[PDB]
Each structure stands twice: as C-alpha cells, then as structure tokens.
C-alpha cells in the first residue's frame with residue numbers, strides 16, 4: 001500500500017465523465033472537473049486538462065496521468081500551507097498518506113476547519129484526533145471512506161485498506 005493505491009481504492013476509476021459524491025462532474029481517478037452544473041463546461045475543462053478534444057471519454061493512461069498530477073498537487077499544496085506543513089512534517093509516511101488523501105478529497109482550504117484535529121495530530125494524540133476528525137461534515141457525508149482515513153491516522157498502519 002501507498003498513497004496511489006490508497007486513493008485508487010477510495011476514488012475508483014471511471015473513463016467517462018461522471019458525478020462525484022457531491023454531484024460534481026469528475027473523471028478518471030477522482031479528477032474533479034468543475035463545480036459547474038454545465039456538462040459542456042465540464043467537457044471543456046476535460047479537454048483543457050488532457051490537451052485534446054475528447055468525446056467526454058479518456059483512456060486509462062490519461063486517467064493515470066491526471067491522477068499523478070493531482071497527487072503531486074495535493075502534496076505541493078500541503079507544503080505551501082503554513083498551517084498544514086508543520087503537521088505533515090511531524091507525521092510518519094503512512095499518516096502522511098492519510099493527510100494527502102484528505103487534501104485530495106476536500107482541498108487545502110477545504111481542510112481549513114480541521115484546526116483542532118491538526119493540533120491533536122501534531123501532538124500524536126491519535127485516539128483523540130480520530131474522535132475529533134469524525135465530528136465533521138466530511139465524516140457524515142462519506143463515512144466509510146472517512147473511517148478508513150481516520151483508522152490510518154489512528155494506527156499508522158494500512159489495516160483499513162487490507163483486502164481492498
């Protein structure tokens with residue numbers, strides 16, 4: 001297990017434009033296209049991202065290319081954020097993957113409300129952090145995924161992703 005395999009489990013792989021859990025147009029391995037309700041706007045974003053006129057359909061290689069860019073962007077975003085970087089730096093590599101997962105799903109300022117969780121994680125108060133992380137819209141709307149990510153933060157193991 002690693003961040004790529006983890007997010008591949010959590011996001012799936014679909015080669016045609018679909019709507020994500022929030023109803024937003026997405027493709028590939030959780031590549032958010034736009035929050036616009038316009039399918040045409042989504043298709044334009046796709047063409048821009050891939051560099052060709054798609055039919056709203058991409059190849060697996062193309063999906064994986066966007067995925068690698070998106071993982072890289074999530075990490076880069078953490079490192080550029082004054083609140084996130086010190087906590088991320090304090091973590092072991094398994095828990096760093098859990099952090100990247102959250103930023104991939106919600107965005108860097110979408111984790112803005114996790115101040116208290118962040119403190120508990122830097123303190124390595126893992127059970128307390130896990131309890132706090134679950135007190136969130138995130139957990140309520142995507143509980144199975146959040147439970148896996150939270151277990152990863154609680155334990156520093158890949159146990160929640162085994163047999164998946």
Ligand SMILES: CCN1BC=CC=C1
Nearest residue numbers: 078084087088099114
């Ligand atoms: C709240 C979990 N995270 B996210 C980004 C960096 C460090 C910890």
Ligand code: NA
Nearest residue numbers: 011012020030
């Ligand atoms: Na998805």
